[PDB]
Structure 1
Amino acid sequence: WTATSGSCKGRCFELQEVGPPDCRCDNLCKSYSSCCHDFDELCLKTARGWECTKDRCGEVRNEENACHCSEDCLSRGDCCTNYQVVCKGESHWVDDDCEEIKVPECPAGFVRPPLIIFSVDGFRASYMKKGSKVMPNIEKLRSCGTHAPYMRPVYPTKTFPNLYTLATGLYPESHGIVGNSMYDPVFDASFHLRGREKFNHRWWGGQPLWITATKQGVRAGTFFWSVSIPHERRILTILQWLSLPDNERPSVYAFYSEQPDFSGHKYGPFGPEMTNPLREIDKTVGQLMDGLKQLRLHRCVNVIFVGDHGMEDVTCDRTEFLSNYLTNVDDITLVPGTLGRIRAKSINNSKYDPKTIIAALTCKKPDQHFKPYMKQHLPKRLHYANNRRIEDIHLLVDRRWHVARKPLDVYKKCFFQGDHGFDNKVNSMQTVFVGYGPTFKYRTKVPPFENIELYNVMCDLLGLKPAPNNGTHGSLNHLLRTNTFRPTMPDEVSRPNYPGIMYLQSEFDLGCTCDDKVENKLEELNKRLHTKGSTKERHLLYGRPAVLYRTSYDILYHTDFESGYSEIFLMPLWTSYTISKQAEVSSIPEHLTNCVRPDVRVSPGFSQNCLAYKNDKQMSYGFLFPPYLSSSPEAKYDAFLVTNMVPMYPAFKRVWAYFQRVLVKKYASERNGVNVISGPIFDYNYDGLRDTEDEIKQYVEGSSIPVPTHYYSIITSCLDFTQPADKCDGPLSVSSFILPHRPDNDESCNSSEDESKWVEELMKMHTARVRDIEHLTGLDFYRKTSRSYSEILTLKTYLHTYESE
């Protein structure tokens, strides 16, 4: 109950929220149904509209007007934004030449340039070019400030998950807003866009920018605008707050527009009806910049123009229906649309079975427009699993499609022509970023980057210390003129052993055989040098990875490859090798088909054994350095050492063997040599983070050989591909992947065919950032390059997307 009897006089859009049931005059009062009786009258004035005209210039103040054109308005901070233009012969901000802002030019008593986040919903990246004719204010921001060709949202590419990722630096799985609809089994509560429950603080994890600011003594304006407050009034409110006294004035502000998303759902992303909403958003930006110019803050404020997600063409006829796959359709609850989430309708039903639901949804129709996944099998780049609000069964829906439970759901709920929510690598889902102001660079293009990175930068912009988040702080230093964060490399926690020859062959009883007893002082010295690391500068180009946790491991050198071998996991944490453009692929000789060789540097007690693989009928083995790429028949024996062996399901070995036999050589030819680092990943609790040994759920039968959940590779070469990978003077180029280690190829519908038709497609789906692999392994790569650390940080966050341009 709200006692709405008090008044909002002198309190309109008050910053602090008063204790109920006293009536509120803050922006959120509309949302809680708790405003004072006179809120609309006093705080939402509209009389005479939003612009000055010639006849209002120097008028007598009239407190009823929406904004003012009287002489006292500047000092009151409540002129219409076009006031100086209409009445003082000033130009609009957009008509001024742009001039570099080398230093903040701020009024006296400003302690730091304010930050204004101008956020727009549904603003697809290509609108910057395709709508450029009708968005001159936005185009001036873009071309004069710092911009990216696009910014990658998080998955799912919905509004609340993305704005709250912007606010926190966190993946949706960590901040908890994992969709637009949600059930939390612990609370036994549901979250919906419409309604009241969404305001409860228990949904909202991490620490958003406004709370980070407040805790550290920086005041914030409102971020969540009540939907009924018009845009012109949000702008005027920001401008008024900016005229407050130094002690009361916020340093950080947000504006939000529900356009062009709102129209894009109705008309599709490029419907002719979309021109007008783009014009209107540009008008609003003009109003802000004119308003800042009046207050003399246009060369003082940092402005971020940022979208939450794009928009794709999606109509009712492109809907897949679970009723066409499942007979039990009434025993499930589906969260539908541009992604699918499935759980049992009733928790009292023990006849509900996720295994057969997945199977009934797998490759059932030739052009099926969605793919079912257990959430832990989703591409790791999506970081979408470690939350009880994310259902075990997930459907990744093709772009341009919807999924629904039954047809009745679609017509008793064509309306829409646009939607979003798909995989965050999809081009149509990409959004925008522009930074403009004294702290941003002048006329600078930067590469595309992920919205999870912005929280750190907004904190830098405000001199705040960021709460722990998923950005990689320093990876966006190149956006900034100053206030950069100067990160240091993490310290290595475990130093390696360097074992020499310590064991005789007969000490090993591993049940392994090799046809290798085939027998020179010129080349005896040669092999000794190779085992001591004489070729190491060729295969380990960027230094050895640092191990950032406590463990026991050995560096092992070979002619063709170097490895960091874990005595705990009985396999390499990483294997590093370089394949030049000229390298030759050979095959595994017949006499060496089943060969596995004890490694005399490593004890039997810390080795895998062949018997275990023999006894395990499901599990086979593969090698991290491929025998196919050996530099000589004699170097090929190294590739069969028991220390290069890793456990692999036969179904996975189809993938692995094709990558090693065909793809590495193809990349080396295309990229002028590549350096490859490969290894196992263990993520049994799907938290995106390296498992400790007591978290491993599966071993090769009868042994303590742990089974990886994934295998990674990091493939690096010279960005200037006229230089070979092993002699590169400048910036690097990388692509990486994290392939799920699965006992079937059910994920790939065309897998009965030749690997050349399906494997590369699979690997592209499972593209990754080197940073994702760092989290999953506790390793730190690129420790020794000639490149600045901030540049390496940007490389480590790079994602190779495989979308066209």
Structure 2
Amino acid sequence: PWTATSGSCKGRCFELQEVGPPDCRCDNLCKSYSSCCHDFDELCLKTARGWECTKDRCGEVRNEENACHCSEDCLSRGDCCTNYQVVCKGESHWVDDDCEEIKVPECPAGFVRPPLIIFSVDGFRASYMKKGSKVMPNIEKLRSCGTHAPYMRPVYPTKTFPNLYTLATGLYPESHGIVGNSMYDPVFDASFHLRGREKFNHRWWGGQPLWITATKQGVRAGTFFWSVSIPHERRILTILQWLSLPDNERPSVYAFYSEQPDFSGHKYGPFGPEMTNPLREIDKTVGQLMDGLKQLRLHRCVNVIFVGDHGMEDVTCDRTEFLSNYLTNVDDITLVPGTLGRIRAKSINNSKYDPKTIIAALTCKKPDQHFKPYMKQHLPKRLHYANNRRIEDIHLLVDRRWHVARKPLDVYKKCFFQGDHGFDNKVNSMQTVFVGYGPTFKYRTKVPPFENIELYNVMCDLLGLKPAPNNGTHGSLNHLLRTNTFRPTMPDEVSRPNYPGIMYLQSEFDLGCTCDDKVENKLEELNKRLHTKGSTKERHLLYGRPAVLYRTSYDILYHTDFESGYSEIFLMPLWTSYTISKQAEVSSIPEHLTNCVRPDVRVSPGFSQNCLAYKNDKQMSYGFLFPPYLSSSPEAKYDAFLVTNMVPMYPAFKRVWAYFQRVLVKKYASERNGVNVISGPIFDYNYDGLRDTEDEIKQYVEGSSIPVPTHYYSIITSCLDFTQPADKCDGPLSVSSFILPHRPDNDESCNSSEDESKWVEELMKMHTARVRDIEHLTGLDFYRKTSRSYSEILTLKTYLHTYES
């Protein structure tokens, strides 16, 4: 675009409404667009005499050339140096004052709501709060007096633009569209990059960021972006001047952004000796804001959020893997490189390109290989990184401390750097910070770690806004807040279950199944009837039946050892619930029952699986959701071979599933003092993170209507106080969950030729999940009947067990 830069910034410095080219701009982004009026530096970026009042400037004659003022009129003009009251009026720095609870907002007249200030710091690693604590007194006072988490989990990839835009929208990058710091959109045929002009185009930027949500609901917003050449002292002074505007003109929400400590972290590594100075400097900027707020009498009015986008790991040029050491055809691919890999064909005119051969050439080729290839639909579902045309089908998950590059020349026609980020968002070095301070946040409160996708909802709660639809779980962070909590109701159940009794004779079934189960006592005849009508259901279903939130046809089936919700549409359980006490015994499948499958006389032949389909399907076998190994008695074991408990399983997956059921469930019950397990299938053939309808299923057991799951889940719940058994717990719960990919090979696990005891648990840890992730993939709602507050249950449903030490 052309700009007539001969207009003037007189009286317009850091104006909030941006004017359209060809008119010249005076806003905090004009520099980045080469569009400022000729006099912007002169008028808007004054530097004379620097940023601090000195004793000799106190009561000076106003000089409009000064960067900031120490004259008597400065407080009414809103343009004092932040230290004016300290130097000139005997006041204390905010950091030197005792922490005093802010029970109510203490705001000047005309303030309709406590303003919100988001203070975002690039590359601020979680452990900086403890390791830098001696040189960050302002930050340590926000942290200790307010509400803090030990860390906040970013989104993947743990890069700047994806994380800042997730902070602004509450969306996963797959949904907001900023899926990396570099991208190719094949529909646009356009490329997005850090340097350059394409990234300004609005088409990259999906969802509804907080400043737009605010503006649409009548709440005014400061501009959230700052041109890199505007010094931090000037950003802070601009925020404080905006806070002196008249009521009708004054924003309610503001953002400050620091490029540090990321900028230095890339050069020196996360804990380089050079990193102390950048931490001191950020702390000094926080001190400037808080002193400025105290001058304006806003320091007990404003909610301040101190938040990072991601951490920083040790990474050097010598720890690079080269695709040229794996692929013959390296010139036929494009790689997006570094702390992740994304691969596509160099040319869409190349009908020679085959993803299968590239994946195979990159799979377990070298004993200490520092990346793992995936088709994007096979990535751990917790990453939510697939449902976007900008995310390449082929992905490389790079080990922490490493890079991937196409060939060696890429690394020295561009060592230098000692830090980088972008790795798996569960990696400890990638975690970042959260502090909330103000009237609306709690006083001196620690909260558990949480994900950055949750903050948009809370920022909306802080400003009285209705959030746009997002990936947060609204209410899961109510424990951060003194007031403005959001009081959600549980979703309504959409489908009520049937409770079938005995309706079918054995001879009505023609399923091609056999079982050696013909073995005839009137004591345990009343008992079996009691078990089938749900006499043990209180033991095995501890948190109520899951609610089905979509329209479907399903049956509740009771058994001595487990309860299921059996889908007449999918011909298998949606869910299977069972409790395993610390004392439970593991047993074998008796030799005579190895191939036993039994018709369920509560369920019609036409709503049943059949064994003939599994015999004819040479790729597919079957497993059971309730494990026969954990049967309470020889007689109860027959229930586990019901055709209503069977699910399709590739033999390679049955190795994983059998080890989980035979070894790991009992191990968890031993360690956690009992566990409640809910297991089931997931169908996500379009990798959108959402339950498939039946018309989206791409694979069936050959010759049948039996759909093949993409994944199997388990939710494993126990008492947070492990002195109480899982089935008699009086207080909060503890959960871990997974979503295992249902794959026909174990190529993901490079050690899979060894015994399951060396690789299966490591696979399961990689595919750790939130209960909320399973809710999206299944249309079920769990924990409907506990003694716990709903907000606490929402917090439990967002918990991720990360298995970092």
Output the TM-score relative to the length of structure 2: 1.00
Identify the residue that residue 626 of structure 1 maps to in structure 2.
627
* Equivalent-residue separation in structure 2 for 1:683 and 1:6 (angstroms): 56
* Equivalent-residue separation in structure 1 for 2:680 and 2:697 (angstroms): 16
Identify the residue that residue 266 of structure 1 maps to in structure 2.
267
* Equivalent-residue separation in structure 2 for 1:381 and 1:172 (angstroms): 13
Instruction: Give runs of ≥4 in structure 1 deviating > 6 Å.
Output: none
* Equivalent-residue separation in structure 2 for 1:224 and 1:26 (angstroms): 10
Deviations 1:78-104 (A, max 9, x none): 000000000001000000000000000
* Equivalent-residue separation in structure 2 for 1:757 and 1:241 (angstroms): 60
* Equivalent-residue separation in structure 2 for 1:134 and 1:25 (angstroms): 36
* Equivalent-residue separation in structure 1 for 2:770 and 2:179 (angstroms): 21
Query: How far apart are 1:345 and its partner, in Å?
Result: 0.2
* Equivalent-residue separation in structure 2 for 1:289 and 1:19 (angstroms): 34
* Equivalent-residue separation in structure 2 for 1:108 and 1:272 (angstroms): 47
Per mean C-alpha deviation after superposition, the further-off stretch among 726-735 and 223-232 is: 223-232
Query: How far apart are 1:500 and its partner, in Å?
Result: 0.1
Deviations 1:1-23 (A, max 9, x none): 10011110100000001122111
* Equivalent-residue separation in structure 2 for 1:405 and 1:4 (angstroms): 44
Per mean C-alpha deviation after superposition, the further-off stretch among 30-39 and 623-632 is: 30-39
Matches within 5 A, 1:764-783: 764-783=765-784
* Equivalent-residue separation in structure 2 for 1:222 and 1:19 (angstroms): 16
Identify the residue that residue 416 of structure 2 maps to in structure 1.
415
Is residue 2:125 matched to residue 1:124? Answer: yes
Give 5+ residue unaligned stretches, structure 2. Answer: none
* Equivalent-residue separation in structure 1 for 2:502 and 2:31 (angstroms): 76
Identify the residue that residue 570 of structure 1 maps to in structure 2.
571
* Equivalent-residue separation in structure 1 for 2:761 and 2:316 (angstroms): 31
Identify the residue that residue 455 of structure 2 maps to in structure 1.
454
Deviations 1:594-640 (A, max 9, x none): 00000000000000000000000000000000000000000000000
* Equivalent-residue separation in structure 2 for 1:106 and 1:22 (angstroms): 38
Query: How far apart are 1:513 and its partner, in Å?
Result: 0.2
Query: How far apart are 1:271 and its partner, in Å?
Result: 0.2
Secondary structure at the aligned position of 2:749 is classed as coil
Query: How far apart are 1:485 and its partner, in Å?
Result: 0.1
Secondary structure at the aligned position of 2:150 is classed as strand
* Equivalent-residue separation in structure 2 for 1:583 and 1:27 (angstroms): 65
Query: How far apart are 1:312 and its partner, in Å?
Result: 0.1
Secondary structure at the aligned position of 2:151 is classed as strand
Query: How far apart are 1:519 and its partner, in Å?
Result: 1.1
* Equivalent-residue separation in structure 1 for 2:706 and 2:416 (angstroms): 56
* Equivalent-residue separation in structure 2 for 1:738 and 1:655 (angstroms): 12
Identify the residue that residue 537 of structure 2 maps to in structure 1.
536
* Equivalent-residue separation in structure 1 for 2:731 and 2:431 (angstroms): 29
* Equivalent-residue separation in structure 2 for 1:186 and 1:785 (angstroms): 48
* Equivalent-residue separation in structure 2 for 1:473 and 1:225 (angstroms): 30
* Equivalent-residue separation in structure 2 for 1:20 and 1:414 (angstroms): 43
Matches within 5 A, 1:277-356: 277-356=278-357
Query: How far apart are 1:222 and its partner, in Å?
Result: 1.1
Query: How far apart are 1:292 and its partner, in Å?
Result: 0.1
Identify the residue that residue 72 of structure 2 maps to in structure 1.
71
* Equivalent-residue separation in structure 2 for 1:233 and 1:97 (angstroms): 28
Is residue 2:163 matched to residue 1:162? Answer: yes
* Equivalent-residue separation in structure 2 for 1:18 and 1:159 (angstroms): 28
Deviations 1:456-500 (A, max 9, x none): 000000000000000000000000000000000000000000000
Deviations 1:163-197 (A, max 9, x none): 00000000000000000100000000000010100
Deviations 1:329-380 (A, max 9, x none): 0000000000000000000001001000000000000000000000000000
* Equivalent-residue separation in structure 2 for 1:704 and 1:189 (angstroms): 42
Query: How far apart are 1:540 and its partner, in Å?
Result: 0.0
Query: How far apart are 1:694 and its partner, in Å?
Result: 0.2
* Equivalent-residue separation in structure 1 for 2:411 and 2:18 (angstroms): 41
* Equivalent-residue separation in structure 2 for 1:637 and 1:22 (angstroms): 80
* Equivalent-residue separation in structure 2 for 1:416 and 1:64 (angstroms): 40
Matches within 5 A, 1:30-41: 30-41=31-42
Deviations 1:367-416 (A, max 9, x none): 00000000000000000000000000000000000000000000111010
Identify the residue that residue 511 of structure 1 maps to in structure 2.
512
* Equivalent-residue separation in structure 1 for 2:251 and 2:423 (angstroms): 36
Deviations 1:631-690 (A, max 9, x none): 000000000000000000000000000000000000000000000000000000000000
* Equivalent-residue separation in structure 2 for 1:529 and 1:260 (angstroms): 65
* Equivalent-residue separation in structure 2 for 1:220 and 1:660 (angstroms): 54
Identify the residue that residue 109 of structure 1 maps to in structure 2.
110
* Equivalent-residue separation in structure 1 for 2:546 and 2:454 (angstroms): 24
Secondary structure at the aligned position of 2:634 is classed as coil
* Equivalent-residue separation in structure 2 for 1:390 and 1:725 (angstroms): 42
Secondary structure at the aligned position of 1:256 is classed as strand
* Alpha-carbon RMSD: 0.3
* Equivalent-residue separation in structure 2 for 1:579 and 1:19 (angstroms): 66
* Equivalent-residue separation in structure 2 for 1:211 and 1:583 (angstroms): 56
Secondary structure at the aligned position of 1:698 is classed as coil
* Equivalent-residue separation in structure 2 for 1:262 and 1:18 (angstroms): 31
* Equivalent-residue separation in structure 2 for 1:103 and 1:640 (angstroms): 62
* Equivalent-residue separation in structure 1 for 2:348 and 2:286 (angstroms): 50
Deviations 1:497-534 (A, max 9, x none): 00000000000000000000111111000000000000
Deviations 1:704-737 (A, max 9, x none): 0000000000000000000000000000000000
Secondary structure at the aligned position of 1:675 is classed as strand
Output the TM-score relative to the length of structure 1: 1.00
Give 5+ residue unaligned stretches, structure 1. Answer: none
Secondary structure at the aligned position of 1:478 is classed as helix
Query: How far apart are 1:31 and its partner, in Å?
Result: 1.1
* Equivalent-residue separation in structure 2 for 1:756 and 1:580 (angstroms): 23
* Equivalent-residue separation in structure 2 for 1:490 and 1:433 (angstroms): 30
Query: How far apart are 1:770 and its partner, in Å?
Result: 0.2
Deviations 1:756-792 (A, max 9, x none): 0000000000000000000000000000000000000
Secondary structure at the aligned position of 1:510 is classed as coil
Query: How far apart are 1:28 and its partner, in Å?
Result: 1.3
Identify the residue that residue 28 of structure 1 maps to in structure 2.
29
Secondary structure at the aligned position of 2:199 is classed as helix
* Equivalent-residue separation in structure 2 for 1:307 and 1:554 (angstroms): 47
Query: How far apart are 1:39 and its partner, in Å?
Result: 0.4
* Equivalent-residue separation in structure 2 for 1:618 and 1:518 (angstroms): 34
* Equivalent-residue separation in structure 2 for 1:42 and 1:679 (angstroms): 65
Secondary structure at the aligned position of 2:574 is classed as strand
In the alignment of these two chains, the number of paired residues is 804
* Equivalent-residue separation in structure 2 for 1:378 and 1:543 (angstroms): 32
* Equivalent-residue separation in structure 1 for 2:444 and 2:639 (angstroms): 53
* Equivalent-residue separation in structure 1 for 2:259 and 2:403 (angstroms): 22
Per mean C-alpha deviation after superposition, the further-off stretch among 221-230 and 602-611 is: 221-230
* Equivalent-residue separation in structure 2 for 1:363 and 1:74 (angstroms): 66
Deviations 1:560-590 (A, max 9, x none): 0000000000000000000000000000000
* Equivalent-residue separation in structure 2 for 1:224 and 1:779 (angstroms): 40
* Equivalent-residue separation in structure 2 for 1:699 and 1:536 (angstroms): 32
Secondary structure at the aligned position of 2:783 is classed as coil
* Equivalent-residue separation in structure 2 for 1:430 and 1:6 (angstroms): 46
